[model samples]
Target chain A: MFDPAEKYKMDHRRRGIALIFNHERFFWHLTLPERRGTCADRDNLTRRFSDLGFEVKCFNDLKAEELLLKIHEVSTVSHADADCFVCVFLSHGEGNHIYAYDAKIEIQTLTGLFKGDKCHSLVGKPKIFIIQACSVYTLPAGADFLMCYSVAETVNGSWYIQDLCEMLGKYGSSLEFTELLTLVNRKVDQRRVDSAIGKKQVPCFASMLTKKLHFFPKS
Target chain B: MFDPAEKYKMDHRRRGIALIFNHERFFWHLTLPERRGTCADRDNLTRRFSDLGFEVKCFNDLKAEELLLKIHEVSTVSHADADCFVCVFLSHGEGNHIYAYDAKIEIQTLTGLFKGDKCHSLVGKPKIFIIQACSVYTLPAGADFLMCYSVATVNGSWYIQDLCEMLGKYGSSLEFTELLTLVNRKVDQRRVIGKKQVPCFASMLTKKLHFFPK
Candidate 1:
């Protein structure tokens, strides 16, 4: 949505820095799309976030334990000067968590490091997480089939990423990520409601962001 | 990763606010997974952002024009006071852009509304765009048959929601939405490299915002 030609048309000022981490590959084996999802595109996001002025720390395919360590290292650095942290996970998942390469580390375990009691350095700072994986299993009835099959019967697939991408690509520069996701929820809800699909695809959410993050930092 | 039990566990002071918009059904209709190779979960992301204290405005099943109007409305109301603007898209897309309900509306059409020369209200404010849809059409060959079959050949499906949920469910209190998306990028990148498929995504970011009123 940004026009590169207008790069120098606006004013330049210093705002809070953003730290981005991308977990694409992990351990030794490749985290297949079937098991997880789009792992290759993490760099795109990393570069994009970097362009936004946050120092980015992108990692591809790190083991859960390694990821934790990396997070610690990054947190230590960010604590020194950075304003906040942003993390993205494109991997396999369950009802309430995500799986590391070996399915040994849960998403919660890794994120727990930033807790106020745990990582005092980042205590109270905005700790944002963006996950792209299948957490729940809900099958769309045969009658509900518009073009694709039901998600409940499907083994490893999610419908959120597509919506996320479209929204961001279309409206990221105009709306905040938080607002965009809410719109997606309403859209999905309406679809199910209009289709009269008995099952609802629940997109689980939990947060503790104590502060507000402007899509663009105010200088 | 936020411990619901830790009520008084102060992590860090609040800094900024965020807004999120997601459109799952829009992509579902495109059968993106069958065309590309990935998808995302957007609903969970909204909750994650809201948890961060952002005055979020969410919309669903909005036509391209309707979406544009909503953006205009939000901009008119918040541009004067809000520090930055964030927008997330979860629908079908072409290279470097996304569709707003059946490819009728281009991504740029909406984002252009925030331009300093256009919507003077948001002048100098950070305009961050996070797109989770496919931007290319090239498909890799020689992947695991099962994996290849699981993904779409032309367009992908939703994976953002899953990634966002994982962050929300696992990400602790100190984690911010941006940090969580970074984690997702890492995990997703690791899973797709050297495979027969790839995820499609893009973003337009502006740093150091300076709203007119400020």
Candidate 2:
């Protein structure tokens, strides 16, 4: 029973697009270990977002130009009846770049292709980009968009993904992104492992959503 | 109102020795920024710990061997009547090597000198080491000690400043682990020079130490 007057608001989320890009293997490698736990992330996002009524699209591995084209093709799609856009990038990253199957891509230029004005359908809609990488430029999460990074540059597996997935499963539809993020911080920081020093890793974010966004439709 | 058994236990803390080391200005002209905020740590720790009935020993700009010798000299001393030993290491560090004014000292080699067997009197007592530098060896693990490590940051009051503050405000009120937790919290709440530098407390400390009230 979503009211008609709030059509635009409800429609976007109802027809949301969750584009998840997770690249575990590289073309050129010196015997890299399996990015083991990310499969959990893939399966969970697919399952959870679907439950939240999101149209989920997940890509395993693509080269820089190919990935760039894929995102452009999707962003330029008619969001005429769709909701919002959510992008999850999980890979090894350097300053302003992400590792593709074969090479590196400039994060800024790649995501910049989806600027709201450029992609008119998503201009006033919410776009969320969560990156599980380390170091530099993330044009993807800029300009009032929310970009969340999974604490310090790591390898293979992250303690952060589990908690993030857990919290999202519990609170994604209930709490605002800000509050949910706070819980993720407290929950993750306390049990931070892997580092010899037990350094606290905070999921830093940037946001410019004009209004509060929810994952689930109203009761 | 002091209990008889508590006297010896309390005596250890009452007559504690806190050795403070602040090494700035390396001999090599490698162009390092002055680790400017450490003197604050030097003064703050000396005053605060001394106020807790500790004997504070302060040293600055020592060579690697000189620093190691000093640590050996003190750790080997009789802690026969003291409650605990607190060592503060503030310097530039790499690969677990804390820079001396003259040379580099492996932190592993230095701390091993204070083992319970090596330093007979400090056996079973708390040997707390606060390292204000980045990464390195966690020597002879499975021992009874507490180590607080600091990450590199660019400007403003460093991790030690946040640490000394926490100790002063909570020393007489919290347990050692609790004190470290608060230090971790305080430092985590602060951003030094452009990023979040969270202090890490590595504890093989088996004993539950309460400096003051529960």
Candidate 3:
């Protein structure tokens, strides 16, 4: 299971491929509030991932059909040379649907394409889906994937993502993935929405890691 | 200075009286969901506070005005023998109001009755207001008082008991604010109502307190 010079190239090889769908504006009909701080979140996530040596592919905005197809297209590719796969969705939603500029799509339509059978090379590898919108209360159950959602549904901007980037920046090297997410939950719990309601937040996740997942293994 | 037995009954002098408002069924006129599990929460809090040596007075179903007057009447008692004052509200609430049997009442209006000059007997002592329902957007901050609110405002009367349970064990040694931090971490680590919640505490207290210190 070892490739020649793989240890040396691990830094480059472990730079997993990531796809980010950053939705800023919505269609005129729905007229959802403009996501103000998402661009900062997008920038934050992109830089954090980049610093971690990930090969990131970020898209600005796409409608429902376009997002699904693009995810499918990425999932079809061989992951033989990569370490993992990651996807990020920054948009307006009501738990189940991630709204695009023009249409709303089930989050599964995109996440489902990268299932074990469909993306064989990434079957046993981690597939991360970061939903920074309103979160789904349930999933059919996941495999080799860890789904993270921002806690409070009240916040308008992307709180989960921002907190995520901050946590990873501080503890990414030392902490395991699940522990990192827990810390994220703790930090997010201390915060309140800027609006009048002033409610607290609880970031959550469902991890199906059969193996201990760490960003960097202690030498 | 505490009493010799450490029964925590040290409050024959200062803040040791509790007024618990337990709201379950509401008037037919107000369309609101019945608060499930709140009775258990109320019982749990009543028992815990009594064990902590506070003189507990619990109220069941009342309309909005009734709630206001009861709180006023209770706060008027001279707290000379008591070390602190405790008020617990367990009910369903939205942004700023907790629902009574017949109507909704502003949280501030109830907690407000115990302010410095308002409830002069409670002056210069901890007026602990445990909001088990939704809570305060703003308060006329005062010293000698600390408020503990359920991490989630949406839940009725759930967090007050959780906070009280923690206070019983660690409260003997830790400062009131430090113990609250422990409770925050404790509740922050748990999820209820199928969602995440983080309880909060606000203190206008000038001096630290160890209701029970090691």
Candidate 4:
């Protein structure tokens, strides 16, 4: 519905801003006793932003309250100096929201802080969010059934995180976050439609960006 | 000549330990002094790694010695926990070495810290270095002579750093530091041969590595 091409032409005058948060070991239910939480995901995301020139702040093992606090801190700080902002969450969750240790926070609450009137500093800038989590029903539904599923069962083989990583690794440097997300949709959709078990996990993205932002120029 | 295909395989295994350092400004000289020492280049490089899953440490407006110190610190600390290390230096320098605030340390000396014999923790592990600096003499001779003549000026627009970034971006997730360097060499060489400019830089890779090492 939003025309990135038109917005890009008008908003091509500003620089870029990025923020990354990774929750190394996070899950609401500690059902899988053997899974030890490691901060590698967070560490990797932090390094990516550091390389990109954003004033990156990394928070580890944060609860729902702490997660909110970190979101506020980054949004306020980034709003002060950058032209745009990017936030990444690597955690455990169900449909439409992620769990912060014991509680869950809707992704919208954190991203909503940057609305035009709310965060005037980033009014015309783009705010991007990348979430890597399971957000579908546990059992694999037949491909034609539920468009939106919840994390109710174990993913048989490939992980949503790895798929996103591979996609980012291939396109993050050159494509705008929005364009990349579109590609992600195609990839996830293809995987689901082609598979016999319907074991596909698709990422959900919601944005209120008023301007266009590109991570790298196309070759 | 090293095999580019084999190098790519090794880089994949060593990806977990690679550290990418991107430097984009210089303090000593610039026509536009106002914009001389900003951290845009390093910033861009850091963001790329953030997406890839690297814990990046960025330093800005640092002298050569300060740069070396930070490199040592990262290599030392990262070796303890990470499997490999990467360094990206963006500054003014001659071939063979980079200039520090107090003195000049051969690029090799800084990278040598990770050698198997020296830093046993990362020994047998890959140590990757991506340098964006000038490292060639200003003259046209032999096949090199023909190359320099094409560009008109010997030292104006050639940069290894830009080439490195471009190759890395296009090579996708499968390419390694070494393979990227080779791609850089081929591209630069073609440009030089076509335009008549001396090759601007060279790469010195000490060992083989895979992208994700256990």
DockQ of every candidate: 0.02, 0.02, 0.03, 0.01
Q: Lowest-scoring 10 consecutive residues by lDDT in candidate 4 chain B?
A: B141-150
Per-residue C-alpha lDDT of model 3 across residues B1-214, encoded as one tens digit per residue:
2111111233454447778888878887687667777777777777777766778889998777788888888878778777788888887776567788888877777776777657775555667887776412333234444556563523324356556666676656655555665554445345431122246554444344566521
Q: For model 4, how does the per-residue alpha-carbon lDDT over B101-194 read when each residue is reduced to its tens digit?
A: 3344675567555544445555433344555544122211101000110111121223333433543454344323333323323433444221
Q: What digit string (tens of lDDT, one per residue) describes model 2 on residues A70-180?
A: 899887887766667778888877666677787777766656655655666765566677777751233223232555666443332466677677778888876555446
Better of 1 and 4 by lDDT: 4
lDDT of candidates 1 onward, in order = 0.42, 0.62, 0.63, 0.43
Candidate 1: list runs displaced more than 4 Å: A1-37, A40-44, A95-97, A135-158, A169-177, A187-199, A217-219, B1-214
User: Model 1 lDDT vs. the true structure?
Assistant: 0.42
| Count of clashes in candidate 3 | 16
User: For every model shown, what is its TM-score relative to the native structure?
Assistant: 0.38, 0.47, 0.47, 0.38
Q: Write the per-residue lDDT of candidate 1 for residues A1-219, one digit (tens) a residue.
A: 211111111122322233333444444464445444354345455545654555656665566677677767755553534455566666655543455665545554555555555555454345556655541221111110101111221122245545444455555544544445544433333344333321233232332221233445335
Q: Write the per-residue lDDT of candidate 3 for residues A20-79, one digit (tens) a residue.
A: 899888888987977777778888888887766677888877877777778888889888
lDDT of 3: 0.63
Error of 2 at A197 (Å): 26
